[PDB]
Amino acid sequence: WNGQLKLLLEWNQLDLASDEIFTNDRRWESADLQEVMFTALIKDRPKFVRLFLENGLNLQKFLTNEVLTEL
């Protein structure tokens, strides 16, 4: 899944990723969306951030001290 997700995120096609990928219903672990959220914030992709938050991502867990200082 990661290759397709990263590709769609890079090209900023919300609909394709939301429908074809995130509708799979397979387990979505925290670290996955942690990495994709970190790469989404830098590239200024707000819609993907909203999609990740909706699909489930503990933002407080994600925002570590290291992440904030690096950002």
Next chain:
Amino acid sequence: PNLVISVTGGAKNFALKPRMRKIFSRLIYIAQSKGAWILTGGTHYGLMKYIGEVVRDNTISENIVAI
């Protein structure tokens, strides 16, 4: 007076889609208004946790009972 049975355990992971979210928020509001029961699986992961959080905030906002 009123009972609602929401099927649980179908999906281990639940997507908080606005279409799928506002419906259950309104359902919980209706149950509170009419003092209905809601029956769910009670698992921590999935829709059960969302329903529990909604009930908790509504109680913060007693009259609604979830089993």
